[PDB]
Design a protein around this ligand. Structure first.
Ligand SMILES: O=C(COc1ccc(Cl)cc1C(=O)c1ccccc1)Nc1ccccc1
Lengths: 403, 535
């Protein structure tokens, strides 16, 4: 099989990202994994004249004893020429969607001779009592943007029979993944999947449920100066989203220097105002649409007690989607573990709906994140991310979301 | 001899061309000495007499170390040569080496000239041997091997050595080899006689590849002086650290001193440089002489005693627990020692007080834990069990409700005061029966003229006029005034966006002298409730 000429974007030089320290347990695994890939001719050791580098590490998603190798090509991907995969809006509209890792399909296609060097990666060594073990690819590498694109013709060809046999099922491909969606009953759905698996072996999401939860202001028997002050703080800020939100009559019940604990009887005006504000918050703000030409942003706030809120958007205050995530069983004492599952969860939803990953604003310190995230990562892909300082009010606001 | 190894394909940076710098003029003496040298080299196959072709050139010099030696200046060729993979710039640490019954170092110095050079790049290494004055044309040469001083030599040589050792390593994996510069450190737990035999087998193996064997004079022995340490069979130590005794100290003298002492504060428990560092105030020149105060004298006197103390580490045993204990030496300052067996430390250290915006002890502890975790993973490929001076209750109470993702790996509590804890905890709800201060602050940001004050539900009021302040400062002072004029329980209402920040993070240390004054008041109350309301 031939090799299509692949190139870096005009003016882009290859990646030179440094390898982050790996634990001995992980190094041993990549060594084994890599030795075997070398034998199968998939990768080759390289010389010192190759200055490029991409980080690599090892994960474990489904299987237990087994280790998987995950290479972080985000940078090379950003510098790789453009081509792709068509996104079907019907995907999100399916009762059930299952993800399948078709990363191995690429080990069959050779990678352009001259582009290989840009795939250089390094297995680190403990205490540096050894030089790193350098390699580059000979075949399409997993996680690389150009892989699914080049193996595009071969994916439609092998998928067509199943798509023809079942024109009521939608199949979407992003990176190494294949998102398969249908409406069939659970059992019939899963049984229908293996049909695809078996087909593939020869070469559990539910979007409809995904609610768009609203904000719910507190309702109380009696209101204290403090209560009003707090409702007003949130309302005010929230008016950045909804301009019909007002706090005039409420703010008036604050005129005076009363004890923070004193009960204030709501006037009828403050009541209507509260009533008008509640109606307004019964639905998402009108006019927010998805714009393909812009980047999707995912912001996450640590609510506490294992709770997290997020908002996907492209323009500030114009949320395409908002939601909440409650730490899964067992992450009780690990913030970093809850945060990584949320990112994976938010990224997967994002892929399903718009076919692209969002850029995250993570409420965690860079050092904290980079030191441990791979310990819990399980996806074949990796989103972009920056670290931020959660504004006190944004958290207070979305904490109000309805349950 | 030249190693029959395949060459590494080198290139010049994007488009650039070979260097052309012109030969510095030399005397008849230095020229005759170089001709001697270059003839001996041409013979060994190292370099080659070339001709008219080559447009490139590099300046050759002659230094005396006491016979004449060559010195090619490859700076220009080095600016034009492609980049190579880091020649491994990750410095190992003694605490990471696994003990070995026997370690033997093997020197491969002139090995640089033992590895051939990409015959395609050779032209770029052309240099010239001048004629007496500037008379007739000089003799011209080119390198057939890795030139000493050229950008790519260390990397290519390392790479080359690595390939050459792969066979040997395969055959005997119970042997460890560390490649550092021109040296090979070979260790093993075999019996001395067998070890010695393997060294000779290896030495013999390298000979086969044109990588010559050192003499018995050039043969180094234990302990080994490496990157500043002394590695002994059963333990490692720090080379003696000496401090210059004088009756005259210049600015430069004191800065270098402070430098060496700050370095030593890592391995040595107690080094202090406050009094010496003070001597740098208002200095006007690096050569100015600053009389050491009494205190700077008492200090520099005490450190000398400390450095005379014996501080050693131990090596790594993969079969014992990796433990790390931490201590809060002072606000924003921590000391840590990582060990396996009690009292036998593998490594130790400290993280300096980084004066910044605002944070808290549990957070800083949390960051000290992180830096150490990354350090161990790098050195031992695993994270240690932590013994921290903070209660599981204190931790669970702080982490569980903090706005930022944070985490501490597996840890235990050790009651070695001072203990790290929360200095204060703002109330969750307004305090009943506690006065409520409605504070406010305003200042003409241009005239820096403002006022700060409050009015309480109890009818208590105040207003102070501040000369030369900022909006922020008046807001914060409004709060400060409220804190100092109130009882042990206060409710405080403010519209300061900043305060909203204090509510969320509740710092116990900041860089602002004002925020710090407020923190001290906060800490002093029995209960305090801060409420923010839009302005
Ligand atoms: O028992 C150990 C543990 O250290 C080692 C283990 C393996 C190897 Cl290849 C080298 C070392 C070094 O000491 C070393 C020397 C020099 C530079 C860098 C590392 N050392 C030792 C034994 C007998 C004698 C002296 C030391």
């Amino acid at each position: 099989i031939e090799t299509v000429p692949v190139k870096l974007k005009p003016g882009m030089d290859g990646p030179k990202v440094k390898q982050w320290p790996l634990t001995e347990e992980k190094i041993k695994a990549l060594v084994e994994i890599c030795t075997e890939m070398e034998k199968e001719g998939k990768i080759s050791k390289i010389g010192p004249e190759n200055p490029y580098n991409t980080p690599v590490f090892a994960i474990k998603k489904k299987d237990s004893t087994k280790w998987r190798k995950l290479v972080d090509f985000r940078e090379l991907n950003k510098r790789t020429q453009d081509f792709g995969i068509p996104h079907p809006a019907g995907l999100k509209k399916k009762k059930s969607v299952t993800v399948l890792d078709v990363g191995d399909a690429y080990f069959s296609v050779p990678l352009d001779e001259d582009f290989r060097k840009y795939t250089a990666f390094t297995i680190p060594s403990i205490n540096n009592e050894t030089p790193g073990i350098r390699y580059q690819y000979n075949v399409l590498p997993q996680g690389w943007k150009g892989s699914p694109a080049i193996f595009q013709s071969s994916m439609t060809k092998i998928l067509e029979p199943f798509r023809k046999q079942n024109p009521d099922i939608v199949i979407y491909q992003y990176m190494d993944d294949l998102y398969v969606g249908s409406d069939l009953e659970i059992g019939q759905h899963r049984t229908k999947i293996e049909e695809l698996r078996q087909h593939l072996l020869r070469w559990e999401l539910h979007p409809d449920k995904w609610t768009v939860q609203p904000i719910v202001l507190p309702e109380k028997d009696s209101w204290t100066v403090n209560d009003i002050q707090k409702l007003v703080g949130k309302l005010n800020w929230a008016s950045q989203i909804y301009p019909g939100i007002k706090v005039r009559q409420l703010c008036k019940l604050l005129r005076g220097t009363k004890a923070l604990t004193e009960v204030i009887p709501l006037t009828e005006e403050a009541e209507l105002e509260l009533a008008e504000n509640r109606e307004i918050l019964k639905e998402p703000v009108h006019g927010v649409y998805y714009d393909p030409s812009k980047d999707l942003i995912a912001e996450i706030q640590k609510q506490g007690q294992g709770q997290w809120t997020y908002q996907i958007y492209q323009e500030p205050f114009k949320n395409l989607k908002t939601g909440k995530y409650a730490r899964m069983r067992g992450a009780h004492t690990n913030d970093v573990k809850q945060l990584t599952e949320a990112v994976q969860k938010i990224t997967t939803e994002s892929i399903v709906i718009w076919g692209k990953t969002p850029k995250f604003k993570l409420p965690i310190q860079k050092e904290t994140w980079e030191t441990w995230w791979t310990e819990y990562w399980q996806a074949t892909w990796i989103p972009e991310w920056e670290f931020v300082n959660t504004p006190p009010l944004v958290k207070l606001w979305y904490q109000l979301e309805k349950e | 001899p030249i190693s029959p190894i395949e060459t590494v394909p080198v290139k010049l940076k994007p488009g650039m061309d070979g260097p052309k710098v012109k030969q510095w003029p030399l005397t008849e003496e230095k020229i005759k000495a170089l001709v001697e040298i270059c003839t001996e080299m041409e013979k060994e196959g190292k370099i080659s007499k070339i001709g008219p072709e080559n447009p490139y050139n590099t300046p050759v010099f002659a230094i005396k170390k006491t016979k004449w030696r060559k010195l090619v200046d490859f700076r220009e060729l080095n600016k034009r040569t492609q980049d190579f993979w880091e020649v491994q710039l990750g410095i190992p640490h003694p605490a990471g080496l696994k003990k070995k019954k026997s370690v033997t170092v093997l020197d491969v110095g002139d090995a640089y000239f033992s590895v051939p050079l990409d015959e395609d790049f050779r032209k770029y290494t052309a240099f010239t041997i001048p004629s007496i004055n500037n008379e007739t044309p000089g003799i011209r040469y080119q390198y057939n091997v890795l030139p000493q001083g050229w950008k790519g030599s260390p990397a290519i040589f390392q790479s080359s050595m690595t390939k050459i050792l792969e066979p040997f390593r395969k055959q005997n994996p119970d042997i460890v080899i560390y490649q550092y510069m021109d040296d090979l450190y070979v260790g093993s737990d075999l019996e001395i006689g067998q070890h010695r035999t393997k060294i000779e087998e290896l030495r013999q193996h390298l000979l086969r590849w044109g990588l010559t064997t050192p003499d018995k004079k050039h043969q180094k022995e234990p302990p080994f002086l490496w990157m500043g340490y002394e590695l002994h069979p059963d333990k490692w130590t720090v080379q003696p650290i000496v401090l210059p005794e004088k009756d005259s100290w210049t600015v430069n003298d004191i800065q270098k001193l402070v430098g060496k002492l700050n370095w030593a504060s890592q391995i040595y428990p107690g080094i202090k440089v406050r009094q010496l560092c003070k001597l740098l105030r208002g200095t006007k020149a690096l050569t100015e002489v600053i009389p050491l105060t009494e205190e700077a004298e008492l200090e520099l006197a005490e450190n000398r005693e400390i450095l005379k103390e014996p501080v050693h580490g131990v090596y790594y045993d993969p079969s014992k627990d990796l433990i790390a204990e931490i201590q809060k030496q002072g606000q924003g300052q921590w000391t840590y020692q990582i060990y396996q067996e009690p009292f036998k430390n593998l490594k130790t250290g400290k993280y300096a007080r980084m004066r910044g915006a605002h944070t808290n002890d549990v957070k800083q502890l949390t960051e000290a834990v992180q830096k150490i975790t990354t350090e161990s993973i790098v050195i031992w490929g695993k994270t240690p069990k932590f013994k921290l001076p903070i209660q599981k209750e204190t931790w669970e109470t702080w982490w569980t409700e903090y706005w930022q993702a944070t985490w501490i790996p597996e840890w235990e509590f050790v009651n070695t005061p001072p203990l790290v804890k929360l200095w204060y905890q703002l109330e969750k709800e307004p305090i009943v029966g506690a006065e409520t201060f409605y504070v406010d602050g305003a200042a003409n940001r241009e005239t820096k003229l403002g006022k700060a004050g409050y009015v309480t539900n109890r009818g208590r009021q105040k207003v102070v006029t501040l000369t030369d302040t900022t909006n922020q400062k008046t807001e914060l002072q409004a709060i400060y005034l409220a804190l100092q004029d109130s009882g042990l329980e206060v409710n405080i209402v403010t519209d300061s966006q900043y305060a909203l920040g204090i509510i969320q993070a509740q710092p116990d240390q900041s860089e602002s002298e004002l925020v710090n004054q407020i923190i001290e008041q906060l800490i002093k109350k029995e209960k305090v409730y801060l409420a923010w309301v839009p302005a």
